[PDB]
Amino acid sequence: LTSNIPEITPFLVFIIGNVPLPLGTVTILCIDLGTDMVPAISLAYEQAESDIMKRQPRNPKTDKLVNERLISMAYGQIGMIQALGGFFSYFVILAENGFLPMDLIGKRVRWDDRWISDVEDSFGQQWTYEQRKIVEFTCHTSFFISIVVVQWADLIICKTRRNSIFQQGMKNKILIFGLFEETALAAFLSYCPGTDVALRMYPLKPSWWFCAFPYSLIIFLYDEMRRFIIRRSPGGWVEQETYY
Amino acid sequence: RQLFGGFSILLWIGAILCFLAYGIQAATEDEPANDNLYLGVVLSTVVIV
Amino acid sequence: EGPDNDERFTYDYYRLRVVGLIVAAVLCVIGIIILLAGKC
Amino acid sequence: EGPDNDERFTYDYYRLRVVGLIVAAVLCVIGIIILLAGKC
Amino acid sequence: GWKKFLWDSEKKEFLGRTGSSWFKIFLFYLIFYGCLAGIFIGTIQVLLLTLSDFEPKYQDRVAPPGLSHAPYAIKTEISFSISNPKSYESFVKSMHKLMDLYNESSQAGNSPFEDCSDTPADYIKRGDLDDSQGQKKACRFSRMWLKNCSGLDDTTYGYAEGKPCVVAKLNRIIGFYPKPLKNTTDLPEELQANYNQYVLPLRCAAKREEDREKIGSIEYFGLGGYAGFPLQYYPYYGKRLQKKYLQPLLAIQFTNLTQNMELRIECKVYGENIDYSEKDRFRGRFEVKIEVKS
Amino acid sequence: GWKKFLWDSEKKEFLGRTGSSWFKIFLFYLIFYGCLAGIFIGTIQVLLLTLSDFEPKYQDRVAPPGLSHAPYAIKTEISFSISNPKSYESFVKSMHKLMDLYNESSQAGNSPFEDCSDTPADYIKRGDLDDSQGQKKACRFSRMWLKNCSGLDDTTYGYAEGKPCVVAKLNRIIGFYPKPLKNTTDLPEELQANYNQYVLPLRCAAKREEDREKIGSIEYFGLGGYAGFPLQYYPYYGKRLQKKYLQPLLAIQFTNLTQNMELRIECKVYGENIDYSEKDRFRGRFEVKIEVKS
Amino acid sequence: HFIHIITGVAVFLGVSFFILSLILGYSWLEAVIFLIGIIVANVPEGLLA
Ligand SMILES: C=C(/C=C\C[C@@H](O)[C@@H](O)[C@H](O)C/C=C/C=C\[C@@H](O)C[C@@H]1O[C@H](C[C@@H](O)[C@H](O)C[C@H]2O[C@H]([C@H](O)[C@H](O)CC[C@H](O)/C=C/[C@H](C)[C@@H](O)C[C@]3(O)O[C@H](C[C@@H](O)CCCCCCC[C@@]45C[C@@H](C)C[C@@](C)(O4)[C@@H](C[C@@H](C)CCCCC[C@@H](O)[C@H](O)[C@H](O)[C@@H](O)[C@H](O)[C@H]4O[C@H](C[C@H](O)[C@H](O)/C(C)=C/[C@H](O)C[C@@H](C)[C@H](O)C(=O)N/C=C/C(=O)NCCCO)[C@H](O)[C@@H](O)[C@@H]4O)O5)[C@H](O)[C@@H](O)[C@H]3O)C[C@@H](O)[C@@H]2O)[C@@H](O)[C@H](O)[C@H]1O)CC[C@H](O)[C@@H](O)[C@H](O)[C@H](C)C[C@H]1O[C@H](/C=C\[C@@H](O)[C@H](O)C[C@@H]2C[C@@H]3C[C@H](O2)[C@@H](CC[C@H]2O[C@H](CN)C[C@H]2O)O3)[C@@H](O)[C@H](O)[C@H]1O
Ligand SMILES: CCCCCCCC/C=C\CCCCCCCC(=O)OC[C@H](COP(=O)(O)OCC[N+](C)(C)C)OC(=O)CCCCCCC/C=C\CCCCCCCC
Ligand SMILES: CCCCCCCC/C=C\CCCCCCCC(=O)OC[C@H](COP(=O)(O)OCC[N+](C)(C)C)OC(=O)CCCCCCC/C=C\CCCCCCCC
Ligand SMILES: CCCCCCCC/C=C\CCCCCCCC(=O)OC[C@H](COP(=O)(O)OCC[N+](C)(C)C)OC(=O)CCCCCCC/C=C\CCCCCCCC
Ligand SMILES: CCCCCCCC/C=C\CCCCCCCC(=O)OC[C@H](COP(=O)(O)OCC[N+](C)(C)C)OC(=O)CCCCCCC/C=C\CCCCCCCC
Ligand SMILES: CCCCCCCC/C=C\CCCCCCCC(=O)OC[C@H](COP(=O)(O)OCC[N+](C)(C)C)OC(=O)CCCCCCC/C=C\CCCCCCCC
Ligand SMILES: CCCCCCCC/C=C\CCCCCCCC(=O)OC[C@H](COP(=O)(O)OCC[N+](C)(C)C)OC(=O)CCCCCCC/C=C\CCCCCCCC
Ligand SMILES: CCCCCCCC/C=C\CCCCCCCC(=O)OC[C@H](COP(=O)(O)OCC[N+](C)(C)C)OC(=O)CCCCCCC/C=C\CCCCCCCC
């Protein structure tokens, strides 16, 4: 559910702010059924944190499976950071090729016209229709890769609900395999000859793969301190507000 | 029984809606995007599988 | 430079794809190693 | 636990020193490698 | 249920919490989102510092250059009746919009428009891409050069009696030097005559072998009377260093056009750093469908 | 030079800059140092969150336990004249400071001082190191137990007529269980008699073989009349979980002490989790230099 | 109960971006189609598998 937000916000800013489409449909499909699955399947192999044969039976009328405390995390805090990281890699790709963030607002109507072969950028260059479309597609590829990068820290902060990572431990071999495969698939979809004709994903330059790293580290640090106040302060605000 | 179950309903409509949009988009213009014929065959596969 | 500044408009995407594939392959292998390491 | 909780007051400084020395040695070697790599 | 979860009067709760809860949550989200906004803004400012103002860091996606045209035809088709005047209005309004930028009133004084050779010439380098010598100077391009398609004599530009014009234009690229083909034994048929090295040739033809006969006399108008672009208007230094810059233009009159029949005309520029693409039908060449139905 | 770099009146400069410069620099340093302070404070708050309030994370630097004493002798020497009263005042003031904490008035009511066995007994576990059962309860230790050194009869405690006392004390350690030596054939000579398992023995002697003769009768006072510490006062749960806790004490009277001569007396505790150190002369044992010069 | 909440948030994001789009100058046909696209995006397809 965390991956949702960074999948809808691009279109919302598209219709309201009038900017070129940040996340394509064949890329959402690649994340929705590619990257997410193996890790989500691996999250089942997680061992207990505390003694499970010691707690009382769950109340059916109060402790549900999906409460508002979860929605506040996935839809509210983690997904938001992931969406911001994606919009960062996007603006970087368009600024390095010629379209600065001030000239993108108000361009969609002429960016999508199939009969305007002269679109001026922030520096004065004239771009044909197919040329600007290639850049938009490369922005979709990097957006998808940014999603995978932030999903790394999301799969690690989702591994444990309360306990710390330095306590439980990364003894789950399936999760490790999930991260490795999740990265190999993105690189494969972006560098195999014939993807720009079949799936529309262009190769990325090596400096762009590092635009999502800080957001991931931040997600990890935020969730770590979150899981810390719950332990030291039982029954406090962080527990009745963020404890799934 | 298993095909019309769990949340296969959410996805059945998603699939139906996807092919409806491809129908309308196809008979209206000869050059429509196909984000729907794919989105629909995929969604449907996630239910059949 | 000057008139023959043709390099200013060229990029070696070929070499980039070759390297990116070598790397993807390596990551995939390492993954398999970790996965099967224990069942032998 | 209880009365015989003697472990709660022991630390294996020996093993720690052994490892810290192995590591120091390795770092020292790597350094030399980098320094002389080129003059051969 | 329905009513109580909405508003109970013993615990003074609305939707579930009290006033102090809604306040604690609203304050938390305001501080959280505020920090998020400040972080995103800082990471965008460092980005404004990385790039240069006089030159795009990457120029590989725009090469070679395209070939656009006025008028603005949708689906690359120019169809209009010689009787109904409200048929070619959408075209003239565009043609006019394009030529309205070459008005002599705009080009006046010493700056930043200097008088250049009335006959094609070689390149002109106004230094590097710096701010040292201020704003560079661009060559003047007069309207009148285009003889029968200028909107100065026959405002309509031709569409009035079955003789249309097509003003072709080369896509502006920073630091791009056009290089024409040399006089060696290998050169297309057409290009042999009038080999003005300093001129980049543009030549239109018919897509199919049949249509040849149905297409009449392609009359090109340009600088010096040649069917090309003079090399003296290059290179382009970019908006920041060359505001008030005009790119050459080439007019094409399709005289003697068969009536009531769709004609496919493909125009193409030639040169060394010019390459076409089977996917982009506007890279170096362009296609137009003309049908003067009357 | 001298005068101008200090104050010129044309550019209105002081020390070198104008008013707006000193302001730009002062404002920058204020913001910079403010951010530095906030960062250091945040990194210290996360540290306050890491650790536990009822138990030090590392307890390897304090084991085994030491052996301190009252009085407070500097260089481990107790020298005083039996005539001049202003000679043993610094000692009595300390002894008194230590015993002043065992006043019966302080130990009153059911909490948190419960009555314990008047004779040595075994350990007592008041649960785990949690806040579940509130503040734990500690055993009461009466002053009178120490018979001739209590400051209740002879305030001076002995120093008045050439017979001093030395109240020994075992260093308080959280969760430390004292373990005395067993009755097996291997045990020091001294310890054989009065083997009260529940008592940790303390025995003083002479550092050198010669001094033996010059040292008289070491009379130990303690709980039950034994020369040790009762195991019932352990373990210690820490200040937070056991405020108002009293540690056992053992009085030692050095009767029949030779006059006008420095005597080196070494006291030593025995037990399993007790180990001495050749570097720390207070770990398990202690040394005292006594010289009753009169 | 999971499907219940997921749909809750779907109609909320849609009626809200509907009033917002009308505040920006769009017509009722295009704005209606925007409410359709946002609801379809709130569908977890791998959640089923
Ligand atoms: C198939 C689909 C649908 C469409 C597909 C489409 O593409 C295609 O199929 C085409 O359709 C093909 C169809 C072809 C059909 C036929 C053709 O073959 C044939 C040819 O068509 C050609 C045309 C064609 O070329 C066309 O152009 C095609 C395009 O069509 C669309 C056009 O744009 C546009 O619609 C044109 C349509 C037409 O023009 C509309 C006309 C109007 C309706 C109407 O007015 C006309 C007219 O009047 O209608 C009359 C009939 C009447 O009875 C009707 C009664 C009216 C009711 C009135 C009540 C209104 C109402 C209603 C209330 C509920 C609310 C309320 C507020 O409003 C309330 C208020 C009241 C009080 C208002 C009362 C007003 C009264 C008005 C009425 O009376 C009438 O207007 C009136 O009578 C008039 O006559 C009269 O003139 C009036 O004029 C005035 C009235 C005003 O105008 C009007 O009122 C206005 C302005 C209202 C304004 O709103 C008011 C505002 C100002 C505002 O209030 C305001 O002030 N604000 C001020 C703010 C302010 O100051 N602020 C100050 C700030 C200070 O701080 C005047 O005022 C009035 O007084 C006056 O009376 O009451 C009558 O007939 C006539 O009168 C008629 O003329 C657009 C497209 O459809 C299409 O391209 C023709 O040229 C040709 O000749 C013909 O042959 C399915 C969609 C897909 O599913 C979806 O994928 C889709 O594709 C995407 C969404 C695309 C988008 O994205 C694309 C890129 C990628 C996408 O694809 C990706 O896929 C995105 C995805 C999506 C998701 C998410 C994600 O991303 C991905 C992930 C998903 C996956 O991941 C998941 C996991 N996570 C899993 C999986 O799901 O999936 C993009 O490329 C797309 O672009 C993009 O869109
Ligand atoms: C600027 C860039 C920002 C990037 C942000 C995203 C970061 C996300 C990726 C990686 C984060 C790594 C976090 C490191 C955590 C280490 C924790 C650790 O070490 O805790 C020690 C545990 C505890 O042990 P214990 O005391 O319970 O044992 C008891 C044994 N008894 C029972 C026998 C006594 O020990 C154990 O877990 C057992 C040993 C497990 C060793 C794990 C080593 C593998 C670690 C990471 C794999 C790399 C993934 C890379 C993904 C990229 C793909 C291209
Ligand atoms: C433990 C078990 C381990 C197993 C690991 C298995 C890993 C498998 C690794 C690699 C195999 C991948 C498939 C290989 C595809 C080869 C495609 C190829 O060689 O194409 C070459 C030609 C390109 O020629 P050109 O440059 O002249 O074209 C110019 C076109 N112009 C000029 C018009 C733009 O192709 C074309 O023309 C047409 C391109 C056809 C598109 C085929 C791509 C398939 C699409 C999606 C499937 C990917 C799903 C992901 C599966 C992940 C599994 C882990
Ligand atoms: C367990 C982990 C699974 C990981 C797998 C990732 C899941 C992927 C999920 C969704 C992606 C599927 C979307 C299908 C996209 C089809 C695109 C298509 O049909 O585009 C049509 C293009 C036409 O393009 P154009 O008009 O520019 O041509 C102009 C040619 N002129 C100008 C030269 C004439 O034709 C061409 O590309 C011709 C080449 C045809 C390429 C077909 C590639 C099909 C790829 C995947 C289908 C199988 C996936 C099953 C796995 C499910 C996993 C759960
Ligand atoms: C690119 C993405 C960047 C994202 C960065 C995000 C950084 C922002 C992180 C935190 C800012 C939010 C602080 C909000 C403070 C106001 C909240 C408030 O008003 O709270 C009131 C309560 C005190 O009420 P009570 O419980 O006594 O009343 C009992 C009432 N009853 C019964 C309901 C429980 O407050 C409490 O409990 C204390 C709880 C305070 C919350 C601690 C959360 C700390 C989380 C993260 C900080 C770590 C940042 C690491 C970043 C590294 C960057 C490299
Ligand atoms: C248990 C142990 C397991 C170990 C398994 C190890 C597996 C082997 C590992 C690595 C193999 C590396 C193969 C390297 C292939 C290099 C191919 C290459 O560099 O081709 C580049 C060129 C296309 O360049 P272009 O000019 O069109 O660029 C576009 C220019 N524009 C768009 C600007 C005009 O190729 C062409 O022309 C011709 C291309 C012909 C088709 C080659 C097929 C390569 C596809 C997939 C193989 C990679 C799989 C790696 C494993 C990944 C696992 C997830
Ligand atoms: C570009 C420049 C490259 C420079 C490379 C320099 C080479 C570095 C050389 C060696 C570093 C590895 C050290 C591994 C030593 C492990 C030994 C071990 O057994 O240690 C266990 C301790 C846990 O101690 P304890 O107190 O829990 O138990 C005490 C229990 N008693 C005392 C009772 C016994 O653990 C530890 O010391 C943890 C050891 C530290 C963990 C390594 C963290 C690595 C950090 C960043 C690297 C990330 C790379 C990501 C890849 C990106 C690729 C593109
Ligand atoms: C071109 C290629 C160049 C390659 C060169 C490679 C050089 C060789 C590399 C590594 C050699 C590793 C040697 C490991 C030695 C382990 C010794 C050890 O673990 O001893 C620990 C114990 C002392 O423990 P404790 O109980 O007193 O602890 C205190 C406990 N408390 C304080 C609480 C009471 O030892 C003892 O008793 C007995 C100690 C006897 C003396 C051992 C001498 C070791 C000193 C230096 C050798 C290390 C040099 C490494 C290279 C570094 C280069 C900068």
Ligand SMILES: CC(C)CCC[C@@H](C)[C@H]1CC[C@H]2[C@@H]3CC=C4C[C@@H](O)CC[C@]4(C)[C@H]3CC[C@]12C
């Ligand atoms: C850790 C968090 C809370 C720090 C957030 C710092 C915020 C408040 C800082 C980070 C970067 C800063 C911006 C950096 C650059 C400029 C350009 C200048 O012409 C106006 C101020 C402006 C726009 C700054 C405003 C404040 C700013 C956004």
Ligand SMILES: CC(C)CCC[C@@H](C)[C@H]1CC[C@H]2[C@@H]3CC=C4C[C@@H](O)CC[C@]4(C)[C@H]3CC[C@]12C
């Ligand atoms: C990037 C920089 C500028 C951020 C600096 C943030 C500063 C202002 C933040 C970081 C950690 C914060 C402290 C964290 C915990 C507490 C304890 C609480 O009982 C009082 C507030 C106090 C003392 C906070 C005051 C504000 C504080 C010091």
